[PDB]
């Protein structure tokens, strides 16, 4: 097996998960259907939100297919102060958050958003694993321009790479990730105002079966091209 | 080269550290003699402390060679709620404590020493680097009987292992670290009450030179012996 410098190996046949056109292949979290506000634009995945305002469920977008082991690509660009978010090894639980049993890929205007300086120590800045691990080196180009994000998930260790450059590795069902886990919005011990204690065992539990790629509800400002996966 | 299943060399000599008998090789931490209270006692090294309550320097003891990547081996014995800590990586910087510039393998008695459960979900638990990760599994003998340590250093990974098991492992100069140390007491962000924010930038600066293996001061009830390390 040829591998890459990371360890991942060179071999396999990229899926194209996304046709440039439709959403066929894509559905909401917990549902069959596309949620409202959800569109093709100019060839891109995005989220503009509707006028109905009417409380149907969530409306996180997610690829209908679970993966464990895999390469995914995606390519983004985003607006001036906008916000969007990718999972990648979510569980559908009825009547509980997509992002509970999943890291987040953190996708953000780092120079106009004010999340971009809420989290500690640029946890919450674009390509962070969100509230949990900031990104060093920060590639992300200014908005307005495509980013070429890389999501690798291999015998349980993370990398995520932004613009062809590595910005974090960490590996699930360790002490590790336990510990970044306990400091997290996502911890039983946690004192944020945004704290989702209940979330605590599920995210302690990511990367132990397969799960779902999607995008996050509420993503203004955010296309999505170029979306492919290589199983590993 | 041949690899153990943790990908660290298998080659090299070992270097006996302790003799059995005196502490020769070992000196206080930033001074040449050995500092009141360290003793050898029944063929270990242990520190009992000293009717001399004078303001000397620091206290820690340290083996008088600094190392970067090696295999370290080291048994304890404590008595019972007994407590003391491994320093692996440590600088000598006049002034400020050992434990500035190094994680610390810690040592505790878990059942009867009230630290045990001071940290957050097991960090400051024998074997933890502590206030940072705890470790899972949990390998430790009772209070009374020689357990065995070995900590490797490879390259910037940082293995813990007790009693020959795996306990944790992490990587120096990673954004992982960096979320590790954010959240400790050795943060410029902490508010523990045992905060030590002026530890912040010698800690996320850990493993990128050689450094100092050492043993805490006032580290009551714990005896060492069969000391010695392999340099990679």
């Given amino acids: 097996q040829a591998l890459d410098s990371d360890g991942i190996p060179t071999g396999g046949e990229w899926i194209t998960m996304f046709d440039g056109k439709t959403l066929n292949g894509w559905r909401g979290y917990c549902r069959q259907d596309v949620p409202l506000g959800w569109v093709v634009e100019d060839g891109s995945i995005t989220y503009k939100g509707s006028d109905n305002k009417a409380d149907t469920g969530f409306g996180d977008l997610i690829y209908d297919k679970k993966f464990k082991n895999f390469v995914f690509e995606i390519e983004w660009k985003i607006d001036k102060a906008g916000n969007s978010g990718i999972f990648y090894t979510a569980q559908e639980i009825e009547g509980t958050p997509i992002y509970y049993s999943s890291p987040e890929y953190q996708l953000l205007d780092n120079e106009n958003m004010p999340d971009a300086w809420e989290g500690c120590d640029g946890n919450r800045q674009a390509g962070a694993v969100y509230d949990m691990i900031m990104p060093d080196p920060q590639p992300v180009k200014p908005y307005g321009n495509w980013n070429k994000t890389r999501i690798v998930v291999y015998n349980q260790r993370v990398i995520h790479y932004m613009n ?48 779902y790629i999607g995008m996050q509800d509420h993503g203004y400002g955010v296309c999505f091209r170029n979306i492919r996966i290589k199983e590993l």
Avoid at 167 to 174: A, D, K, M, P, V
Avoid at 181 to 201: G, I, L, N
């Fill in 164 to 211: 062809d450059v590595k910005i974090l590795e960490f590996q699930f069902g360790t002490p590790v990730w336990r510990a970044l886990v306990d400091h997290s919005k996502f911890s039983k011990f946690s004192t944020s105002p945004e704290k989702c204690p209940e979330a605590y065992d599920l995210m302690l539990q990511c990367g132990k079966q397969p799960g």
